[PDB]
């Protein structure tokens, strides 16, 4: 899933 949050 590319829409998962990629930030921290």
């Amino acid at each position, epitope marked *: 899933n590319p*829409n998962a*949050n990629p*930030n*921290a």
Partner: antibody, heavy 123, light 107 residues
Framework: VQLVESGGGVVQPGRSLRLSCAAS????????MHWVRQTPGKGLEWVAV????????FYADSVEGRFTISRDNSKNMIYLQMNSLRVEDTAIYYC?????????????????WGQGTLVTVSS | QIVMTQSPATVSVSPGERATLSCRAS??????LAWYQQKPGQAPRLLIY???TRATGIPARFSGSGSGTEFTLTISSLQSEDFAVYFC????????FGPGTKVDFKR
């Protein structure tokens, strides 16, 4: 917040090229980054995304297997290596940061853009 | 992937008028949609995310509404600075942009 791309230019199809994007004025290791390209004809097209640590990566179907996105958190940089270039890859390539504020139910939009660099694939 | 359609292609507005721009989605994107402003030669600029939330530094005359498949960007009273192209972008399943809508000076 300042995002600056470079590395573009004119290249033959079938050849390769690497792009660079320096990031300033924010905590770089705490944000995922994107590559988005613009064409006069197909408009704005997302290219790839890299996690805040390089852990997970995702690519547009048009560039999967040929493009690879990378980042160095100690250099506050993000790179894009293009392989087996096609003329249809000619575009302006922008550097974009995910989110405006952090949120795990609000992500996937581009809060800050770079000026962009132009890749011209021509014989 | 998901297809964003924008209509119409060009809107003619006089300063002080209301401007409505429509964005439609192939499938529902819940409230995961953004709006961007782009002037010639410059990079895009974030206007509205989610579906209704303004970005930091965007005047109150920019208002976004919508859910699922039909969204609308509104400029309540257009001003000097708003003649540009406006793209919408969904981030529910993938990342796709609309074709854009030009807003020009009415004569």
């Amino acid at each position: 917040v300042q995002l600056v791309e470079s590395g573009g230019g004119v290249v033959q199809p079938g050849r390769s090229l690497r792009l660079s994007c320096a990031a300033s004025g924010f905590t770089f290791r705490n944000f995922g980054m994107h590559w988005v390209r613009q064409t006069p004809g197909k408009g704005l097209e997302w290219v790839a995304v890299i996690w805040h640590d390089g852990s997970n990566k995702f690519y547009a179907d048009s560039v999967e297997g040929r493009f690879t996105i990378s980042r160095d958190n100690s250099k506050n940089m993000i790179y894009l290596q293009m392989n087996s270039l096609r003329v249809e890859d000619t575009a302006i390539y922008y550097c974009a940061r995910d989110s405006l504020f952090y949120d795990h139910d609000n992500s996937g939009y581009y809060g800050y853009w770079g000026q962009g660099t132009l890749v011209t694939v021509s014989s | 992937q998901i297809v964003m359609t924008q209509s119409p292609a060009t809107v003619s507005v006089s300063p002080g008028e209301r401007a409505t721009l429509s964005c439609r989605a192939s499938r529902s994107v819940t409230s995961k949609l953004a709006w961007y402003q782009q002037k010639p030669g410059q990079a895009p600029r974030l206007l509205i995310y989610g579906a209704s939330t303004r970005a930091t530094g965007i005047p109150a005359r920019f208002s976004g509404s919508g859910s699922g498949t039909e969204f609308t960007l509104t400029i309540s009273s257009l001003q000097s600075e708003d003649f540009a192209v406006y793209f919408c972008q969904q981030y529910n399943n993938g990342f796709t942009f609309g074709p854009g809508t030009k807003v020009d000076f009415k004569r």
